[PDB]
Design a binder for this molecule. Structure first.
Ligand SMILES: CC(C)c1ccc(/C=C/C(=O)N[C@@H]2O[C@H](CO)[C@@H](O)[C@H](O)[C@H]2O)cc1
Ligand SMILES: CC(C)c1ccc(/C=C/C(=O)N[C@@H]2O[C@H](CO)[C@@H](O)[C@H](O)[C@H]2O)cc1
Lengths: 807, 807
């Protein structure tokens, strides 16, 4: 149908059809009369997967012959989503399969909806890992993603009475056709035990063994026949009264059972630490095994790069030391040199309560040898600090890996900076904040380590896959090359005054909204006006992201309509979606608030279809792929200085929404690229927030000067939104007035006024769409291909490559 | 090479080769340069499995069209062993695959050795279930095996210091290519809760739900293109603080985790009861679903037969009642009629401590509604007893389902007799003992229910598969038809005086022994004389099977050699193998005794290679397939009246060993079929054992009159076989002298004298082999095909059929 989806040749369609029917028969053990749509999905999945394996096998063969430097991306989170459509897109099979399935009397889009999300992540950090794998494959780097194969990913969110309920994400129930188990590459991981000292050095003994079993998942590059690997570890008990012994195997295997759903607040849970060492221990043995079969570890940094996705795999540093010192018998100073040259650390975390600070007593019991190595690293590091800043005893305690207090803690961020040759933030403003405030001491010691690598998203998933309409009309003007070189989108600037393009861009948006409005009714029984402005905020629920600020605006719009019912206002559908961490009470209250507002606003006949407030249930990658193309307004309204980068922001920009947001994270670079006039900026900058802290933030002040705000607080306090439970939202009002770290009231006025200007622009469709084109045309910088190319050149020391491997 | 293995056509060999290479590439994701032998096995396995599915699909289709009566075989144990060779044999693919693998430069026999045993059973009862499935498929019956998919089958036995160590049988580690998961046929099973009474009857409420997920395994008939199903259930938790909730899913899923390894002694363990209801509950919903889609349950017994393999699935009876009464609203008397007409019960158990007697308090908590139904069944049953035997109050308490005492118990055997239209023993003598003693009262009430169905073994696995040499030389004389009609073996009688046949039969035995003697050295580092008599006892270790009696003979032979070193004796290799239940102390001592005897006898230079005592480690189906063809002497020496039937006895007879044994179980029928002169019978009959009990068994009497026996006991007591621990075997001597339920000393003299006559016959090879031919020629009755044909005609009311389905 559309040209970016590839050719549908007679030969290929014929071949896909018999391979489909073969798998239905031999692999699924069904015939057409008993097969369900799930069976049809699996047959299609197995058919598409057959096209990968040849490429997968010769890609790994290729890396053995040529022996290039290998990139290892260590993360506890890989938020992959669905794999079927992505694989088809990257192999140029999308039309052929659509034609093939159509000729068997099936709708492919219906079969794609049956595939479970691989939700092995929480949000931004996990999804960045997925975009990176796609981009690394596309740029021909010999790159492996390493992580944990959780049996249960992020929980499925269900709303019940406006409250979030969590149920288990049993994503492997029906099987995963994409993974290949490799039980033959199983490796021991050690826990507990104690340290024995001998003449021939230290020895870790009396350990409990857990087995790490790898599962390989293919990662296809975009039309280059490169297929990289993602290797995920699964926990297995070794095989050495009787009944209970066998049942107790579960304790060892619990290590890979479930993803920790907490992305706001650090908790020193033993099981979480086991997960972190597990991934690190098995991965490093795998790395070394591959290096040895290419004794001279001088070359190790020329053949290996290890990227740490935050501090979650920080133990890679002392583990590498342990192996090099205890098992390989290198002297300390030489092992340390190899380690620093090998490792690099990316920070994603601003807020102090999110930083990993492990209690020493935990490391003592579980990883006694790693504690010793950490103490030794700290001592040699602080000696360098003393020598460079003699007398500065304050600097010593601040820079120490060991934090003293009631309970001693290891600061894993300090460990990472010390043992890595490079540390980077994920947006320019974030990288500056790291140098100016939280790692200032470390920056003064080793200024050369600190870099910036502004985040990006993959245009394959986040344009071609989720928005074929938009991808096609762009292709008609400028061709196909933009898909792996997103800077080419700039050529769309010369079409900003083209009447036909303006009409087509606006039509694609209108189609996407119509399709999404129908998804809402069929799957969730809610009706919305498709001619309203689609105002969307989707992301994990945290106070710093300020979903509450959105709520305040929503209530303001409602109150103005009730005050002057017969005045014209731009109709809006306001959609808010996202998961709250299970133990985060305030986040759970905010979700309840949003549904409570919906209960009042959506059933007021004076309002009509001029305002709707919908909470998007179970926000996840596959939902983002649907709602993002349908959005008009992207809400990126975090308190300045709190959102390290953001990545959702970039998804919306690439898909034809305008952004209302603060000068935070990548927003700054987004406005810079598009021009500030094509961006709805508002609120305090970083410097303003700092000025407010010195004086002291008094919320009452804003309550006293702003009557519209006073009315909203009084409605919340007195039960306007909770008639049966008048004091339901007392914690929210109380936090907003006395304990608001994120200064919601301080931005309220500028926010509400900026929102009026959005509505004004939306009243003139032509000028809205022209501003949209200017955003889409300048979104090129935010491709993960650019990001990875900078990591490659400036951190890993490998050159990218767009060239095809033989098919 | 040999003709019974089928044709190796050019077309077929070519086809198997490309399908092999296809699976290696697409399914395993390997190439020839990295593939291990395990990868090669899996490719072969997947190739052979492709030939099954077409037949599997049209077999199930066939049963839907024609709608024949369905046989459901419920067992907690299916001892299947390996599937690859069996499937090849039954599909006539054995030579073709051998030729195909040879042309790819692989040895098929080496690949067969990589397949894990499916050890989902303990011994006789579990293996009988497997033989029955094979025979049911071969006779064209619409038959389904239903059971539990244990993650861990019977433990792998390792000897360490002569002591048994158990380690977990992780048979699914590498995957099972034979099973097809059917997550779409998942069913709820209920536990706990309570009973509510209403106007519309009883209701079971507040239950915990566990999900039962079926896995289907194909069961191919012998060259008839019938492929039946074995459906095994797996436990799954439903999907409805957070971390722990997810980890606690393991508790529900523990139901299908491990096979209870205890086959001697009943233990009222809750988890075991859950296993029993789990299999019964999910299976009966599946049966009913299939019946309803063929409201009139009058026809239920004309379309369904449920066979209970011992009392382990006894709860099928009250569960069927529950469904019929509570959910379908049939009146009690009509539901009861359908239940009795549907169910049938096979007893495998003589010893009282092996009978299931569940504590009432357990049933109360776990299955409250089933307790009520059982009480009601008991009351209506005892009313019939009272009415037929008025005044006999003793009969009432004896026949009751409820046993009174300190703790009340339900007697599941009494439940089964009451709710089944047929009860059978597994050998004629066993079936008579059930009528004369343990179920005498029940026999007097309902004489028509009690039948005999003498056991059998499948000649496919137990001759053609494990003994191709012997199968071939038989085929040369009489043709191929004997393989599915074993009575034809009688035609070998006219070759008892044939010189060439005698030479060939004796040569096959000698080849089998040479092959097995080499297996011992390569895999276990033990050398043996292949010209010795191969004296073999393999079976689970129990006092009633009297491995100790064997030990006493072994020590006697040793002592006679030490006494007159230069006299000639027939050389023997004595092999004893089998597992002991983990908590069975005496069984563990006996294994230690056997290795202790080996430590003395195998390292005495005066003995030479005239006597060897080897303990066969990890006895299991695939080991039985190797050792049985190599045996000369089969030891079946249970105290008369204790071994219900035995089935190993039949395996040895079919494979050219002579039997030394008591008149117990199927031995009686084996001697009858071959003639008593062609059988080494010895010891007390059932009547003699009973005479001894009345007088009282005094072991000291035998110790006083038999000097050779006194010497053996004194050697045991004083530490002759345990120099470092002089009193190691005190429990054994003490049991033998004061607490021997099984009267080992009482048969010693006849046993030792009978063993001398065996040695005498073995000195004349020609006459040994002629006696062997007379055994093999009369082993036809002991085919499971005959057994199943009798179950079919006399219990299930279906006619067998040897006719082929279309290929
Ligand atoms: C509790 C602790 C172990 C923890 C676990 C997960 C997280 C997750 C952090 C995360 O997702 N950070 C986001 O990373 C994105 C990619 O760099 C950024 O766009 C986003 O601004 C940042 O919040 C944080 C702390
Ligand atoms: C502990 C209780 C639940 C229990 C569990 C398993 C068993 C196993 C019994 C068994 O294997 N019996 C054997 O059945 C064979 C086939 O009928 C007979 O040949 C054999 O003589 C009999 O012991 C017994 C009791």
């Amino acid at each position: 149908q559309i040209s970016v989806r590839g050719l549908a040749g007679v030969e290929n369609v014929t071949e896909l059809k018999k391979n489909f029917n073969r798998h239905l028969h031999f692999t699924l053990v069904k015939d057409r009369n008993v097969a369900t749509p799930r069976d049809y999905y699996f047959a299609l999945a197995h058919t598409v997967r057959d096209h990968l394996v040849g490429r997968w096998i010769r890609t790994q063969q290729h890396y053995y012959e040529k022996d290039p430097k290998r990139i290892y991306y260590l993360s506890l989170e890989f938020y992959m989503g669905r794999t079927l459509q992505n694989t088809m897109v990257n192999l140029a099979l999308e039309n052929a399969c659509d034609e093939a399935t159509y000729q068997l009397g099936l709708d492919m889009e219906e079969l794609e909806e049956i595939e479970e999300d691989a939700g092995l992540g929480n949000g931004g950090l996990g999804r960045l890992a997925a975009c990176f794998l796609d981009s690394m494959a596309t740029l021909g780097l010999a790159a492996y993603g390493y992580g944990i194969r959780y049996e249960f990913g992020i929980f499925n969110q269900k709303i019940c009475g406006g409250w979030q309920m969590e149920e288990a994400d049993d994503w492997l129930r029906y099987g995963n056709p994409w993974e290949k188990a490799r039980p033959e590459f199983t490796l021991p991981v050690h826990f507990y035990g104690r340290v024995e000292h001998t003449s021939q050095g230290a020895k870790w003994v009396d350990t409990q063994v857990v087995l790490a079993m790898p599962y390989d998942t293919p990662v296809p590059g975009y039309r280059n026949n490169v297929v990289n690997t993602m290797r995920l570890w699964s926990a297995k008990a070794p095989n050495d009264g009787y009944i209970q012994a066998v049942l107790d195997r579960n304790l060892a295997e619990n290590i890979s059972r479930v993803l920790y759903p907490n992305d706001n607040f650090f908790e020193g849970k033993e099981l979480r630490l086991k997960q972190e060492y597990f991934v690190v221990a098995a991965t490093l043995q795998d790395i070394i095994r591959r290096f040895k079969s290419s004794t001279n570890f001088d070359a190790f940094p020329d053949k290996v790069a290890i990227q740490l996705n935050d501090t979650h795999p920080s133990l890679a540093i002392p583990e590498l030391m342990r192996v090099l010192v205890d098992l390989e018998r290198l002297d300390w100073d030489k092992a340390w040199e190899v380690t620093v040259k090998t490792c690099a650390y990316t920070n994603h975390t601003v807020l102090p309560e999110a930083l990993e600070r492990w209690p020493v007593h935990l490391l003592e019991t579980l990883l006694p040898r790693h504690l010793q190595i950490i103490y030794e690293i700290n001592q040699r590091f602080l000696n360098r600090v003393a020598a460079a800043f003699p007398g500065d005893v304050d600097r010593l305690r601040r820079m120490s890996l060991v934090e003293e207090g009631a309970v001693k803690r290891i600061n894993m961020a300090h460990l990472c900076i010390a043992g890595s040759h490079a540390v980077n933030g994920v947006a320019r403003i974030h990288s500056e904040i790291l140098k100016k405030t939280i790692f200032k001491d470390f920056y003064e010691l080793e200024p050369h380590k600190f870099q910036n690598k502004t985040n990006g998203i993959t245009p394959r998933r986040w344009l071609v896959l989720c928005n074929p309409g938009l991808a096609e009309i762009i292709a008609e003007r400028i061709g196909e090359e933009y898909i792996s070189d997103l800077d080419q989108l700039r050529k769309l600037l010369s079409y900003v005054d083209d009447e036909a393009f303006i009409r087509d861009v606006a039509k694609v948006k209108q189609e996407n909204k119509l399709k999404f409005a129908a998804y809402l009714e069929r799957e969730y029984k809610v009706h919305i006006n498709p001619n309203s402005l689609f105002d969307v905020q989707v992301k994990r629920i945290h106070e710093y992201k300020r979903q509450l600020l959105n709520c305040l605006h929503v209530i303001t719009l409602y109150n103005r309509i009730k005050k002057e019912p017969n005045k014209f206002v731009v109709p809006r559908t306001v959609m808010i979606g996202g998961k709250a961490a299970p133990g985060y009470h305030m986040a759970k209250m905010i979700i309840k608030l949003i549904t409570a507002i919906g209960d009042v606003v959506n059933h007021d006949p004076v309002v009509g279809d001029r305002l709707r407030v919908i909470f998007l249930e179970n926000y996840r990658v596959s939902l983002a792929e649907k709602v993002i193309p349908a959005a008009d307004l992207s809400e990126q309204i975090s308190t300045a200085g709190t959102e390290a980068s953001g990545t959702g922001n970039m998804k919306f920009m690439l898909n034809g929404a305008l952004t209302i947001g603060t000068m935070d994270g990548a927003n700054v670079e987004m406005a810079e690229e598009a021009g500030e006039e094509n961006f709805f900026i508002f609120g305090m900058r970083v410097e303003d927030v700092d000025r407010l802290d010195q004086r002291g933030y008094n919320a009452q002040e804003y309550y006293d000067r702003i009557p519209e705000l006073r009315q909203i607080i009084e409605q919340l306090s007195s039960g306007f939104f909770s008639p049966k439970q008048p004091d339901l939202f007392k914690d929210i009002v109380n936090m907003l007035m006395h304990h608001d770290r994120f200064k919601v009231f301080a931005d309220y006025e500028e926010y509400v006024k900026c929102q009026e200007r959005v509505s004004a622009l939306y009243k003139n469709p032509r000028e809205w769409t022209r501003m949209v084109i200017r955003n889409i045309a300048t979104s090129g910088k935010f491709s993960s291909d650019r990001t990875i190319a900078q990591y490659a050149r400036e951190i890993w020391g490998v050159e990218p490559s767009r060239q095809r491997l033989p098919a």
